[PDB]
Design a protein around this ligand. Sequence first.
Ligand code: SF4
Ligand code: SF4
Ligand code: SF4
Ligand code: SF4
Ligand code: FES
Ligand code: MG
Ligand code: MG
Length: 574
Amino acid sequence: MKTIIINGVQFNTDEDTTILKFARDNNIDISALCFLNNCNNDINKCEICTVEVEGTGLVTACDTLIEDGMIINTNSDAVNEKIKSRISQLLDIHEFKCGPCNRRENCEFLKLVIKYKARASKPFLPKDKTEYVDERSKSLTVDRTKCLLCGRCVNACGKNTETYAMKFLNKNGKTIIGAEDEKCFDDTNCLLCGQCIIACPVAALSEKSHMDRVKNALNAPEKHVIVAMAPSVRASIGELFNMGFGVDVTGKIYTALRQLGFDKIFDINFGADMTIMEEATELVQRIENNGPFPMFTSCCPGWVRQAENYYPELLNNLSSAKSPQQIFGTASKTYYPSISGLDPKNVFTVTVMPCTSKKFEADRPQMEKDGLRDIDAVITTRELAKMIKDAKIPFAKLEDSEADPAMGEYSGAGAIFGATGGVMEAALRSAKDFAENAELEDIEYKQVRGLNGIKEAEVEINNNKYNVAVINGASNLFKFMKSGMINEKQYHFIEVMACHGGCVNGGGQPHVNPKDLEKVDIKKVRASVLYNQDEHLSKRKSHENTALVKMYQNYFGKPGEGRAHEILHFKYKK
Ligand code: SF4
Ligand code: SF4
Ligand code: SF4
Ligand code: SF4
Ligand code: FES
Ligand SMILES: [Mg+2]
Ligand SMILES: [Mg+2]
């Protein structure tokens, strides 16, 4: 073993790890900042994790290994003044205005300033933030007046996407972070997945705001404003109201959306069932025509952009079915009027997503028809949360209400969409019933679930074996293709999500403090909410959605053909 003295307390351990990690595992407080995802800022260590080691001096605990004979002190005056100096220096480059800041209620930096009572040697107060702000992107926004240059976004992008779209840049001899050549992120190989935002300890990286689109549309007398949340929203937004993790708040969201003044409360899970109708039918179609295999999902715009930027040869292999968001939006301007009498142009369709990329998908030029946008606005989970708080809605104390069932009902299949393997399973539940023309009892495909990067399974459909795969994260898509796993066998249907764990870990999701990520498996705790809804729902198949069946019977007809194929589909091409 090793003998380690920390603050006078002796430890006898055989572990090989860092001071920070060992300290955290023994309830010994050590501050940190730039350390996240088992990596720190190598070229510019923040030194917030400084601790004293007798015979060595001050050392960074987040990358310093424990060694026998170490006598560590974490709270000496020499350590605190050092940490206080670094935080003070960061403040010299930080616009310290927490009042209007969108991270006011969960900023790692603010908590560090309060903790050490640090103050700026000179308050950073830029007159014009123009040069510091980049709002060119449809999904991302950079405010470099808040940027600590901790590199956590850069490292996050590398790990999650392996695109390294977020880079350190030298602008006029000044270190900043941004896209390649300081271009607009959209104009680069960036996936707009927002993982860089999630890793950001401050409000330096945020989503491109759409709240003005919403509030204007709401206050517009003639505008009929629809709202519909994604699957993952009802399993995460509760976190930003001190309700904890893994708490279902579906009913509370519906009520909150009515108090905010939305004219109609629908649900994207209804659109998730639609996507399954239009994707399960296509899978069966491609089987009969024998290809083109494999069929890739197309509901994740992060993946779409990844295909557009790295694998354009696969764009014709993507499912023509629109994403649950876009497919919902299409029906909102055509079907919903036909059952409400509303003038389509007065219909304003808003979605609540866990995703920053969804903003880019919704504003795609061709994502419309007859001048009518499928989706007019997308607000992240964080945006809706702020919208609720600004309205002074006591969310945690709201009583449950239901959505409007015309486009608000959803089966358990559409419910699990928010988790990696969700779309896959949901699609197989319908495709097997379609191909075999039956109503099979066994519908649970646990094989394609979980947090494994790459997941594969052999499924039987109409007395024939087919190979499916589920790519869990953009970095795993790169690995899947580069390593030649695609060519090792003939796959017939592949799911691809950009964010590891699925949309429950989207870029528009609530920020989780590093100390909570250690205590909670955010990806599984969030997904559990979705699977629990699937288990307790009467309808667990997309095509068993009564409200949707009505819609298809009375308006669209059959899926994968006629009117359905006409307007609910969207093909990508190189
Ligand atoms: S980023 Fe954090 S510390 Fe800086 S102004 Fe915003 S809330 Fe305050
Ligand atoms: S944008 Fe955020 S994560 Fe990136 S360097 Fe600045 S503070 Fe760190
Ligand atoms: S949105 Fe995703 S791909 Fe783009 S820079 Fe951020 S982490 Fe990288
Ligand atoms: S996995 Fe979901 S949340 Fe992440 S980029 Fe794709 S659609 Fe958005
Ligand atoms: S947390 Fe250790 S150097 Fe940043
Ligand atoms: Mg390191
Ligand atoms: Mg109104």
